[PDB]
Write a protein that binds this DNA or RNA. Structure first.
Ligand code: GTP
Ligand code: MG
Ligand code: MG
Lengths: 49, 136, 49, 337, 144, 48, 145, 69, 145
RNA sequence: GGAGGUCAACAUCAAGAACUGUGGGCCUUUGCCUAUAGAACUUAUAACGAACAUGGUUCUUGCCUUUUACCAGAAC
């Protein structure tokens, strides 16, 4: 990992979320962590079904 | 051979000349990069600005009694080069080689080092001086 | 260590990076009769200098 | 119609000098399909092969510089770039491969031909590629992003030979439906059609100056003005069939390679044929293997380079004695058509 | 001699390519009938050759790696040498392992010249627990 | 290895190619073909 | 005449811009938030009476963009406006150029039954054999005697 | 019912279809920047070049003379 | 991945699907380019008319001449216009040279024993036995002459 | 007006040891020479990240029926 560097990507300044939150369709809140774990499990299971 | 035999050069070529790594179209390097062998500043406009007015120094050269030659010698890691650092960065007002790091430095700025091999080797190899005027 | 295909007794083992040593010109230069064996020339030399 | 025939007897065209055989270069294992020359320094060749390789020959001494492998099948066409240090090679493997001359490694692969791609030509000012082949379509490739930007629907059969021009029509194309189309790429449709060929047009060449093209067929090598698209001239040919390639010297000399092994040299202005040669096949070859697959002139135009089906490249030089003592060739006698 | 080394190696490759799935004891049987031939003919000489030792090792490790593919694994832990080397009468493959030993490694650069002797031993073949296994060349008297 | 291989010395080599030259001559090229390439010649003298 | 100079600096300009329009038109199409980094009312309808203003709608990123793009195949018509005249400038020849039928020993896939003679050397020895046989003959006689 | 081919598929057909928009592996952007140019002997019995072809060449008879043993 | 899986799940798989040449289908393509390349020439030598019948026929003569070249049989056709025979001799000489060179190359790839497929060993064996017998028959004839 | 924000947009971040502006002279804008002002962030056991993944092509190998999936080195 020292021998082959990377030197990442200028213009990468755009991130998935910073682009995503912009839209009408995403809303922000706080929540307990374990609750986010469980929700996301339920999410996934519906997706794969 | 005999089918031609006179003017015609009948040549059967195998293998190669010009081993395959060669560029075969030479990359044009417009600027000349020294940074590989040494680290040295080539422009007239980037030479540091010497708060004592270099022009006034060159005048001292007319007075033979005035100028003096001091060498600095001592065993390994006695601090020679990093001492000449103190003198220099005292004299010059703005040095392009200072990182914000070495300016408050954890790592000593070593001005008189000047060779790549002497940077990586951690040592000083070929002797290097400086000329400057300083007030007694 | 890697470029020279050498190991520090505790260091990592890599690939040759120059897989062919096999080419050897039969020649007088390095012949034993012309060499003086003093000190073994341990690896740590070859990594050191 | 006789008035035209008088108007053929006034001109007495354009003396030139003969050609002869300077050098023979063996060293390909298979046939030599295509040849292109360094557009800047004239220091070398790039020659395709039937063995899939490419062997870069030095023009001066004829020595072999390097070998460029990397195609699995025979290499039908090779073209070198002017403003770029790039080399675009193309084969029967359905792929147009870029080559970075600096480090000699494949950079880019362009994708999406249905089948073997037999012509590449590098548009002069646009950083484009023009590729064509048994697809029966011409693909204008964006050199930078590898996107087949434009596709030109077109000839009813395979496309043998394609060229590029800076002004209107920017692509000239020649197909085995025996037509030659002059393309308008921005709108993406044929600007002009030239049908006068009776069989497959297997080769074209652009005159380096007059802004015209020389088109080939079995027995009749015609010329064409670009722009308006008129016929310009004809070239007198008895059966030379088949014409594999054409090349145009900067002195307005028009070369024609035969499949019968005959080298038919012309003047470009007239249509007159001042010389016809016959190559020597080879030591162990067959009389069938004697033909001329490709050919080119250097930047100057004082030498000729012809890959032949006998697995050899030959270098034809223009004689320096010549003049009027005895040059004269067939001497401009034309039979009624 | 180098030639008949390469003949042996080529023959092992023969056993390998010929049998796609012959099951198991056929493979061990063939390799036995090959190796025993090689040793029994070459008996004394084999001691002094580096490449044929290396090729015995690659050969056996390769056939074991063939039975390992015979199920699914390369894994060392699943297949302790008891699996391979117990004679058929106990239900093991019964192959005859000549490759364990230890292989003289001495001085690549010099051994091109002096014949330095054996200064070092590279590990011939491996295991989880070492145990030991007898190797044929000990059980066949030398030619002298 | 090199040391214990056969050494290359003018007397030696010239003997070898001499012998092989004569026996090369004895057999006619029609019956068989004896090439210097396939052959091996060994010489034991003061120097080897 | 070759096409001057300031003529090509035009075609190159307009063509270059057009190709850029196609490329940029594509790089914004496909599926990559990555590939987009390499990249007006305008409507007078009828008499322009009601004008217009055109405004894009941001798609829900999860839902498919291009809700109607679905891979399907189409046969295109060829609309032929005009005819391109194809204008060009044997007897005993066939006796030269007539190709015979092709009959192989190896394959008869159809089952055509054809005569055996459709299915089915000159040089003599060399005097070397004469010489050799005679020499062995004679030397044999001599030896036996 | 195997047949030679007697034709090819004209790319014109594929030109009229609508694009799918699948993202391939090799079309991810790469190389994104161009580059511009500027007594014992007396008893013995007996006393004392390029051909063009593959099969009749010399290297070939070397080859088959060896690998056939 | 999942980008392709889902966009393919709504929009269907691409209809074009061109497929590149690789190790398995190579020889097929080589055949194909060859038979095409002979179609062109032997269509352009003939004076005018006939096509499809003489197409199929002449290409059959190609195949037969190749088989007879593997078998060392000289392949004389009792009649056939000589220039065609020039052409077919030319192309089958080409294919012959490429084929042989592949035989050498694969062999010296096997002697090193690196990643040769199970079949390529068998096939290469076949090509070598063919070539070896050709060398033999050559030697014997030239001993007669 | 000050302090802040797990807020946003637009710039800039790998190079002749390297930036920008300006004054003056020559060529004829570029470019060279000379004078002057200001240089945030990142760099010498070299770099924005005191951390550390994956992919594509091309070669060399390693497993070894073939392809994905892979073995470990290199270049781009
Ligand atoms: N504690 C302490 N260490 C110092 C001092 N000066 C230098 N060092 C350390 O000593 C080492 C030697 O300093 P340098 O001046 O760079 O080395 P040098 O004098 O050039 O040694 P040479 O290369 O042989 O001339 C450096 O790595 C410094 O970290 C000091 O004043 N105090
Ligand atoms: Mg010092
Ligand atoms: Mg299969």
């Amino acid at each position: 990992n020292e021998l082959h560097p990377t030197l990442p990507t200028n213009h990468n300044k755009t991130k998935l979320l910073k682009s995503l939150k912009n839209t009408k369709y995403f809303q922000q809140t706080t929540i307990d962590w374990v609750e986010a774990g469980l929700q996301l499990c339920r999410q996934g299971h519906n997706m794969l079904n | 051979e005999h089918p031609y035999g006179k003017e015609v050069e009948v040549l059967m070529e195998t293998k190669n000349t010009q081993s395959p790594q060669t560029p075969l179209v030479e990359p044009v390097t417009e600027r000349t990069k020294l940074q590989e062998h040494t680290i040295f500043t080539q422009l007239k406009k980037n030479i540091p600005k010497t708060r004592y007015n270099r022009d006034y120094m060159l005048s001292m050269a007319n007075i033979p009694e005035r100028i003096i030659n001091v060498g600095v010698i001592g065993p390994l890691h006695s601090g020679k080069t990093s001492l000449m650092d103190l003198l220099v960065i005292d004299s010059h007002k703005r040095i392009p080689d200072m990182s914000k790091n070495v300016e408050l430095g954890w790592k000593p700025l070593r001005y008189l080092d000047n060779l790549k091999q002497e940077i990586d080797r951690g040592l000083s190899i070929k002797l290097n001086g400086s000329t400057l005027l300083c007030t007694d | 260590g890697k470029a020279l295909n050498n190991a520090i007794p505790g260091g990592p083992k890599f690939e040759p990076l120059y897989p062919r040593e096999e080419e050897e010109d039969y020649n007088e230069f390095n012949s034993i009769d012309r060499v003086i064996f003093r000190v073994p020339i341990r690896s740590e030399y070859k990594v050191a200098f | 119609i006789v008035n035209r025939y008088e108007k053929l007897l006034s001109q007495r065209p354009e003396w030139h000098a003969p050609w002869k055989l300077s050098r023979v270069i063996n060293g390909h294992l298979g046939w030599v399909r295509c040849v292109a020359i360094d557009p800047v320094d004239n220091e070398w060749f790039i020659t395709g092969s039937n063995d899939t390789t490419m062997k870069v020959w030095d023009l001066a001494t004829g020595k072999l510089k390097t070998t460029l492998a990397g195609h699995v099948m025979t290499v039908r066409d090779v073209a070198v770039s002017d403003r770029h240090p790039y080399l675009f090679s193309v084969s029967e493997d359905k792929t147009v491969k870029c080559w970075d001359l600096e480090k000699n490694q494949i950079i880019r692969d362009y994708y999406g031909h249905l089948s073997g791609v037999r012509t590449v030509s590098i548009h002069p000012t646009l950083d484009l590629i023009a590729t064509a082949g048994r697809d029966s379509v011409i693909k204008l490739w964006d050199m930078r992003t590898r996107i087949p930007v434009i596709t030109l629907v077109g000839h009813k059969g395979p496309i043998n030979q394609v060229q590029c021009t800076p002004v209107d029509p920017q692509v000239v194309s020649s197909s085995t439906d025996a037509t030659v189309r002059l393309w308008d790429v921005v709108a993406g449709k044929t600007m002009k059609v030239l049908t006068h060929h009776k069989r497959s047009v297997r080769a074209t060449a652009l005159h380096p100056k007059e802004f015209s093209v020389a088109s080939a067929c079995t027995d009749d090598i015609r010329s064409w003005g670009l722009a308006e698209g008129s016929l310009l001239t004809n070239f007198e040919s008895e059966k030379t069939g088949i014409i594999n390639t054409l090349s145009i010297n900067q002195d307005d000399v028009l070369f024609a390679g035969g499949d019968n092994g005959v080298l038919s040299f012309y003047d470009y202005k007239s249509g007159h044929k001042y010389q016809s040669l016959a190559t020597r096949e080879m030591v162990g070859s067959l009389e069938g293997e004697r033909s001329v697959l490709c050919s080119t002139f250097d930047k100057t135009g004082l030498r000729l380079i012809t890959g032949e089906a006998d697995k050899s490249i030959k270098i034809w030089k223009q004689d320096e004695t010549a003049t009027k003592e005895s040059e004269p060739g067939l001497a401009w006698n034309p039979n009624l058509s | 001699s180098e030639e008949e080394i390469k003949k042996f190696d080529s023959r092992i490759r023969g056993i390998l390519m010929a049998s796609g799935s012959t099951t198991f004891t056929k493979v061990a049987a063939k390799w036995n009938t090959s190796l025993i031939s090689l040793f029994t003919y070459f008996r004394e000489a084999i001691v002094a050759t580096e490449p044929l030792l290396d090729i015995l090792v690659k050969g056996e490790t390769r056939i074991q790696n063939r039975v390992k593919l015979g199920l699914n694994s390369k894994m060392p832990t699943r297949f302790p040498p008891a699996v391979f080397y117990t004679p058929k009468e106990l239900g093991g493959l019964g192959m005859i392992s000549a490759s364990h030993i230890l292989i003289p490694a001495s001085d690549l650069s010099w051994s091109k010249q002096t014949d330095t002797g054996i200064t070092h031993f590279r590990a011939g073949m491996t295991h989880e627990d070492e145990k030991l296994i007898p190797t044929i060349f000990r059980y066949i008297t030398t030619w002298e | 290895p090199k040391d214990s291989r056969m050494r290359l010395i003018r007397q030696d080599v010239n003997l070898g190619r001499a012998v092989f030259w004569e026996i090369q001559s004895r057999v006619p090229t029609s019956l068989t073909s004896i090439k210097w390439e396939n052959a091996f010649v060994s010489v034991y003298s003061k120097n080897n | 005449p070759l096409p001057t100079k300031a003529e090509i600096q035009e075609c190159t300009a307009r063509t270059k811009s057009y190709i850029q329009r196609l490329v940029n038109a594509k790089l914004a199409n496909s599926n990559n938030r990555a590939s987009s980094r390499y990249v007006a009312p305008a409507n007078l309808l009828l008499n322009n009476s009601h004008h217009i203003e055109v405004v894009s709608k941001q798609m829900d990123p999860l839902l498919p963009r291009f809700v109607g793009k679905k891979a399907r195949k189409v046969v295109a018509p060829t609309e032929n406006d005009e005819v391109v005249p194809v204008l060009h400038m044997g007897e005993a020849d066939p006796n030269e150029w007539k190709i015979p039928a092709a009959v192989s020993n190896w394959k008869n896939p159809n089952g055509y039954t054809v005569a055996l003679e459709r299915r089915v050397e000159n040089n003599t020895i060399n005097d070397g054999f004469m010489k050799l046989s005679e020499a062995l003959e004679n030397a044999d006689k001599k030896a036996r005697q | 019912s195997h047949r030679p081919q007697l034709e090819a598929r004209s790319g014109a057909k594929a030109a009229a279809y609508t694009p799918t928009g699948i993202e391939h592996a090799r079309l991810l952007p790469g190389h994104t920047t161009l580059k511009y140019r500027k007594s014992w002997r007396k008893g013995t019995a007996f006393g004392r070049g390029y051909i063009n072809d593959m099969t009749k060449s010399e290297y070939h008879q070397e080859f088959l003379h060896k690998h056939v043993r | 991945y999942i980008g392709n899986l889902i966009t393919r799940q709504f929009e269907g798989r691409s209809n074009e699907i061109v497929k590149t040449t690789t190790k398995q289908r190579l020889d097929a393509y080589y055949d194909l380019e060859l038979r095409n390349s002979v179609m062109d020439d032997i269509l352009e030598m003939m004076p005018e008319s006939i096509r499809q019948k003489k197409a199929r026929t002449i290409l059959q003569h190609l195949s037969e001449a190749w088989r007879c070249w593997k078998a060392n049989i000289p392949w004389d056709v009792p009649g056939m216009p000589a220039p065609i025979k020039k052409i077919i001799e030319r192309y089958i000489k080409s294919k012959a040279d490429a084929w042989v060179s592949a035989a050498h190359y694969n062999r010296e790839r096997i002697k090193r024993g690196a990643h040769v497929e199970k079949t390529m060993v068998k096939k290469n064996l076949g090509r070598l036995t063919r070539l070896w017998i050709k060398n033999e028959q050559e030697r014997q004839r030239q001993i007669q002459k």
